[PDB]
Ligand binder design. Structure first.
Ligand code: NA
Ligand code: NA
Lengths: 387, 383
């Protein structure tokens, strides 16, 4: 349950049993033949795995430095890497005999992934969402309802993701016997940070095989955006024991790191406890988590995974930040240059990789995790960038 | 250059020279080792081919008849099958030494795919689009511009696809030396209907292999929606010589066949010569809830198929397609394109009658993200 000093299970006693039962079922099923057969089957036929690894030749040559490859999680069913975890946990829940899934969501993206996986496996889905987020994500809320999920607006507290998490936790205490709490990033009490990372590591395993086929060697740098940290852990984890492979996580710089309007928890946060985990959080004088900002809706998780805090501490991975403006420019640039519209979240990784590529030599290789597609962000970009 | 009587090359001598060069290019490259290498590489790494063949277990069990499989073209880069054709023609153009692509569009869906493909290969892209359609498709227009293409609204006359076609053709006459005209369905003069069907036939080849792998036998029925007819021909074509395999093309019934607001060219059209080809045309205003099913014409090869009775052609209404849209989302967690929902709707009706040993493949031509605003507007109008 610990990654160095980060992680743990900081929850009330009523949740210890349910977390124990989940940990027990996961230890059994994670290496179970039938479970992995079905999981790999759903991932192949329904999700469309494997996703390709694409060499961005025009972008590479335009920048004039290192080769830039894109791991195309944007092509997974639903348009984002979140599906990998949603299927894994939903199937796990079915194997544990649960009939219902609950989840929280801020951007709505995890809510959608959860609703998709629940519909697939024939399970009831309830999604807790802060009323302020509900208001701003009307199409995601509609998507969830199309998928047969029930969206429950959370009106308490600040009507945001933090408040939804608290409601979801309260629901699970009472309903855990038939309900699985499907956490959407590498966060929360153990064993969630481990489970989510395990279910996303397929990205890194495919990427490793794909890059070896393409270039006959491991990459020099892997770059991924970091909200809660799941897409980054997914692509990082199989390369952790490859000492030569540099790992860079990109947080939301928002309006700027000194502006006080960003979501760079590792970069500017402090150690604290929330959502059952000891990790880095941006918190106020009174210890309360403060509002995070980013143009990218999905980089709004309040905090960061304990495994990322650990990788930072031991200096296995480096963490940087990219601003809203920089992310936007990358969003336009990739669309024009390679014909791929990325998610605004993923654009942060693209933005940094472009800066990094310029510094590196042409024989060198950068893999960017393109965690999602940008169809969902077109309304946003039109408003901000203009017609 | 013909499919029975249908097809052909009915154009002025201004267009004959560039088409002839296109065939010499296509014949040279269609089977060329280098062209096929690069095409397959882009289809794999950029488009994400192959797409899986998915067994809709819950939907199959619910209906209680035939096994329903979905060929998941919704998973191709861009969320639609059109990408397969866009990459093929754009690559051909680069091989021919062209630096620019032009195309027409109504829904905007083919315009987006051309912009994507053109961006991929570093070509200038100009999309001609009718002004009435430009105003109806704000997000697709924005997409095209974001992808680096220029959208040329046609404000003269009818302001529809018909006018966009005319302007694009005029453009190609002047600029074919450095410009390739990229047609978006199995329509127009030779060699376009053949070329587009060729570039989409990968759908059927994957599907054939995938169904043999899954079930050890060919399917009893293949169902696909029909606008211009590219996704249906793509999946149909590799099974044409396998005689026990029924082929069904599903047209837009719209408000109703009796209502006169639909796009069912084969069911209610008349034979005519348009877009430089002999085929079925309605011209009249076509209507459908699914934007991509707007084309009043239909591919000549579907004309050829209907006359010899090799494929059957049917229609599904706006209301039925909407029902299937909701049904597939809730039952399989797959939100289909409204075009594709026409096929799903018909396949569901068809499954009920058939036995449990029997197999249906539905071509899920696209994803429904693009249609959510439309469906929200209608869904919010329910009582
Ligand atoms: Na954060
Ligand atoms: Na038609």
């Amino acid at each position: 349950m610990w990654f160095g000093e980060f992680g743990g299970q900081y929850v009330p006693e009523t949740l210890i049993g349910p977390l124990k039962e989940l940990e027990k079922a996961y230890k059994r099923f994670k290496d179970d033949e039938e479970f992995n057969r079905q999981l790999n089957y759903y991932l192949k036929t329904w999700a469309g795995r494997p996703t390709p690894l694409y060499y961005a030749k025009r972008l590479t040559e335009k920048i004039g430095g290192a080769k830039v490859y894109l791991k195309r999680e944007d092509l997974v069913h639903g348009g984002a890497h979140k599906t990998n975890n949603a299927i894994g946990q939903a199937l796990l829940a079915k194997f544990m005999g649960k009939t219902r899934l609950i989840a929280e969501t801020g951007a709505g993206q995890h809510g959608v992934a959860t609703a998709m996986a629940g519909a697939l496996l024939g399970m009831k889905v309830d999604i807790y969402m802060g009323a302020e987020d509900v208001e701003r994500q009307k199409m995601n809320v509609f998507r969830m309802k199309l998928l047969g999920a029930n969206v429950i607006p959370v009106n308490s507290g600040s009507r945001t993701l933090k408040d939804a998490i608290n409601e979801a936790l309260r629901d699970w205490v009472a309903t855990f016997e038939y309900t699985h709490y499907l956490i959407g990033s590498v966060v929360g009490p153990h064993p969630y940070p481990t489970i989510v990372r395990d279910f996303q590591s397929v990205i890194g395993r495919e990427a490793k095989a794909q890059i070896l086929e393409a270039e006959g060697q491991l990459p020099d740098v892997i770059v991924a955006c970091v909200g809660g940290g799941s897409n980054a852990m997914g692509i990082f984890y199989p390369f952790v024991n490859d000492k030569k492979v540099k790992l860079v996580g990109v947080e939301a710089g928002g309006k700027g790191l000194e502006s006080g309007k960003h979501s760079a928890s590792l970069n500017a946060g402090q150690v604290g406890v929330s959502h059952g985990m000891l990790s880095y959080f941006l918190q106020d004088e009174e210890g309360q988590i403060k509002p995070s900002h980013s143009i990218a809706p999905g980089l709004d998780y309040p905090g960061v995974g304990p495994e990322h805090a650990y990788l930072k501490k031991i200096q296995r991975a480096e963490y940087v930040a990219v601003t809203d403006e920089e992310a936007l420019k990358a969003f336009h640039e990739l669309s024009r240059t390679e014909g791929i519209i990325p998610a605004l979240e993923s654009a942060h990784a693209v933005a940094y990789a472009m800066k990094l590529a310029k510094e590196m030599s042409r024989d060198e290789i950068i893999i960017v995790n393109l965690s999602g597609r940008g169809d969902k962000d077109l309304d946003i970009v039109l408003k901000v960038s203009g017609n």
